Amino acid sequence: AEEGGENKSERAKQANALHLLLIGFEQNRERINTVQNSTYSMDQLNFS
Amino acid sequence: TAFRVSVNGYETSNENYVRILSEWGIPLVDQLIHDSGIESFRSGIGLYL
User: Fold this and answer.
1) Closest chain B residue to the Cα of A41, Cα to Cα
2) Cβ separation of A40 and B10 shorter than 8 Å?
3) Where is this protein found (chain B) (predicted)?
4) Closest approach of A30 to chain B, Cα-based (Å)
5) Cα dihedral angle (A26, A30, A34, A36), rounded to 10 degrees?
6) Rounded to a whole number, what is the distance in Å from the CA of B18 to chain A's nearest CA?
7) Cβ pairs A/B, distance under 8 A
8) Chain A positions in Cβ-Cβ contact with residue B10 (cut-off 8 Å)
9) Surface-to-core class of residue B24, CB atoms within 10 Å of its CB (0-12 exposed, 13-18 middle, 19+ buried)
10) How far is CA B7 from CA A7, B12, B19, B24, B31, in A?
11) Any B CB within 8 A of A44 CB
């Protein structure tokens, strides 16, 4: 709101980037592994 | 070799182990033992003795 939009300024985008990153982490909390990079295929994640 | 074995990163080691053998089978093992070199070593010492 202060910046008037996510894409208005570079600093706004980075705030949006972290905003989406933190939200992105929150939406995919189960699939994340602490150390090893979790690996899955289309069938393993149920993607059709 | 004539084999074209491929490794899948989405399968576990055992899953690939079962899959690879189910595809090719014993002939791959024979090549592995041939490349091991134990057969040549036994023949060499046997000939010498």
Assistant:
1) B10
2) yes
3) Membrane
4) 18
5) -120
6) 18
7) 5
8) 39-41, 44
9) middle
10) 43, 10, 10, 13, 18
11) yes
As a whole number of Å, the CA-based R_g of chain A is: 16
Report residue A35 as tokens: 């150390």
Experimental approach: cryo-EM
Residue A23, judged by CB atoms within 10 A of its CB (0-12, 13-18, 19+), counts as: exposed
Chain A residues with CB-CB distance to B13 below 8 A? none
Query: Resolution, in Å, please?
Result: 3.6
**What is the spatial distance between Cα B10 and Cα A34, in angstroms, rounded to a whole number?**
18
Instruction: Quickly count: other Cβ atoms within 10 Å of residue B4's Cβ.
Output: 7
